[PDB]
Amino acid sequence: MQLNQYTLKDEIGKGSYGVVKLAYNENDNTYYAMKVLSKKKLIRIEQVYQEIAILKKLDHPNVVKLVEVLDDPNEDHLYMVFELVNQGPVMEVPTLKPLSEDQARFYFQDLIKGIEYLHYQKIIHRDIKPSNLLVGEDGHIKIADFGVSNEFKGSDALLSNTVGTPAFMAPESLSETRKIFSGKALDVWAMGVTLYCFVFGQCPFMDERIMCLHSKIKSQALEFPDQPDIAEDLKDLITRMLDKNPESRIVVPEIKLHPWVTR
């Protein structure tokens, strides 16, 4: 499959919308990641162009760079070319091979930087999870998939829609009654779920039945698996990130000063 200078190869991810394919670029003799979208499949335009707008203003070592967009109005397919991050996702969940505490800290430091940057740029990511965190050749993670991200005006996003990955959704986004909830806190909750996954290899709240998953997220006290044992300070940080109450939940400026993070 040829598309200008790019030859499209195998699928390397799904994501919130469309698919991601490896692409060889004949002009500079290296590889890219190409997100491929069907206009007809998205109908059943503007949300895509808002994602492009977001991506265009972003430039940080812990966020995946958009290189260009190929958008022929006579074709159904829209192509978004990104930098390729060689090693791919930090982990698949579940896994029996979780990260050590030291590896988790290292990636979690990158995650903090990335998220701090996004929030500064007035973007709520909305889909933070291990499979969206790509390990670069330098060993550092980069945040990917802005498919469900929101841009806001003023100091925080005021949100009412429920999107993202169900196991990573904050309890305040799961009410039966339409509610309004703050966006920065949602990303903190998902960072917490992610950190739990990093060290345990499974999510904190799990069920095959979507309604029971929601029920657990809202009403089941957080439990730690029997293995591996983790340090008291990491338990503390995870507990404060997974605070069901978005008002008392730890904020990113506090996370950066947490003893687990800074030791």
Ligand SMILES: CC1(COc2ccc3c(c2)ncn3-c2ccc3cccc(N4CCC(N)CC4)c3n2)COC1
């Ligand atoms: C083939 C291997 C390499 O994997 C990969 C995967 C995605 C890779 C990658 C290397 N460099 C970049 N990206 C991207 C780029 C843009 C994306 C825009 C939207 C969504 C994506 N993703 C992120 C990962 C998720 N699991 C699926 C959706 C995106 N990914 C796996 O080990 C080698």
